[PDB]
């Protein structure tokens, strides 16, 4: 869709400027510097969590994770954690063993199947050659008759 906007070039022909304070100067502004707000979130996917805190491949994350509280009247105080993503867990290790035993199975199928076909086919040629030897005995009879 085609829409009209205004050019980037600044002049008095403007109504606002959104400004971001980079460096904190001499004076102490009461509205801004006093009230501290934290950053809402930290890495969600475990692999970026692993890069974040330099944890090893083997060890557990559950132990180090921070969990922020939940508390209000009626309900009890609680703490809500994140879904550990990328966890090398016994289940997943089972999935890992699983695909390799299945790969065992497809390799077993291809090999047994090729050997079975080779036996059936080589046997077929053996009987066909014996019948040809039969055709040749009939061939000498037919030429002599």
């Amino acid at each position: 869709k085609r829409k009209s906007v205004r050019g980037c070039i600044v002049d008095a022909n403007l109504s606002v400027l959104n400004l971001v304070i980079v460096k904190k100067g001499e004076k102490d502004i009461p509205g801004l510097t006093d009230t501290t707000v934290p950053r809402r979130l930290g890495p969600k996917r475990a692999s970026r969590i692993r890069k974040l805190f330099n944890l090893s491949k083997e060890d557990d994350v559950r132990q180090y994770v921070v969990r922020k509280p939940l508390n209000k009247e009626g309900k009890k105080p609680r703490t809500k954690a994140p879904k550990i993503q990328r966890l090398v867990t016994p289940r997943v290790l089972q999935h890992k063993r699983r695909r390799i035993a299945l790969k065992k199975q497809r390799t077993k199928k291809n090999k047994e199947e090729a050997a079975e076909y080779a036996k059936l086919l080589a046997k077929r040629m053996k009987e066909a050659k014996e019948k040809r030897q039969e055709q040749i005995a009939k061939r000498r009879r037919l030429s002599s008759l």
Binding site: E113, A114, E116, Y117, L120, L121, R124
Partner: protein
């Protein structure tokens, strides 16, 4: 048209399903599958219109979602899956395997069999393709690709498969004398011995047949289905034997049946 049609009108459905004139506007469109749109029978139809257990789709959905039924030895939950000819619809709770075979009229018949004989099925092969590493592959009428078969399995043959494994046990060759179901056209659901084969380059070859009662009839290969050695079958056949008796013989038998009922 910018593409394929997703709906089906009630009248355009083929009449050999015997769908009625006045209940509703639509018919259930088969999903693609191993069987063509026009030769097949939806499961909902075999169930409600044919078998009459369920009235509506909510009851079919719950029975279908119980997952008892197992089509071609594999579980299928798509209600418009086309189960076709020789196709064994097995139910476990009842302990009842049915095989979809044709009546004397083009329609199918309710021909029950035991689970023992019902335990396997037959498949006509269509083409022998040679595979990626000198590996022969087969292609049947119902799209099963079996690899490493015998080179002796050929063009118009059949095979006696096993539903559990999906592997060719035996096969029956196209030769003189073999029985033959006619699987399309005017003689659809006929049975008769292969008396003669007439070749035609370009236009496809005709097969002359002789009925049990000497009534000859020809048919084209597309509508042919080999079924046994000689004139002696290895399978269960419908009552009637695909004979298609005449209007006079039906007047006598039907009328006499009315007389017998009283």
């Amino acid at each position: 048209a910018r593409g394929p049609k997703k709906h089906l009108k009630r009248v355009a459905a083929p009449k050999h399903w015997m769908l009625d004139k006045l209940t509703g506007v639509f018919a259930p469109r088969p999903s693609t599958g191993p069987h063509k749109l026009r030769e097949c029978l939806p499961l909902i139809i075999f169930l409600r219109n044919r078998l009459k257990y369920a009235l509506t789709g909510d009851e079919v959905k719950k029975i279908c979602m119980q997952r008892f039924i197992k089509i071609d030895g594999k579980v299928r939950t798509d209600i418009t899956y086309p189960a076709g000819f020789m196709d064994v619809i097995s139910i476990d709770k009842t302990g009842e395997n049915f095989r979809l075979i044709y009546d004397t009229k083009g329609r199918f018949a309710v021909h029950r069999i035991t689970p023992e004989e019902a335990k396997y099925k037959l498949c006509k092969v269509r083409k022998i393709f040679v595979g990626t590493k000198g590996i022969p592959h087969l292609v049947t009428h119902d799209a099963r690709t079996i690899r490493y078969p015998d080179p002796l399995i050929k063009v118009n043959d059949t095979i006696q498969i096993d539903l559990e494994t999906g592997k060719i046990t035996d096969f029956i060759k196209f030769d003189t004398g073999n029985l033959c179901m006619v699987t399309g056209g005017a003689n659809l659901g006929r049975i008769g011995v292969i008396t003669n084969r007439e070749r035609h380059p370009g236009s496809f070859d005709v097969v002359h047949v002789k009925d049990a009662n000497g009534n000859s009839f020809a048919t084209r290969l597309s509508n042919i289905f080999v079924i046994g050695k000689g004139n002696k079958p290895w399978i269960s056949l419908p009552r009637g034997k695909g004979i298609r008796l005449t209007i006079a013989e039906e007047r006598d038998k039907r009328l006499a049946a009315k007389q017998s009922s009283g």
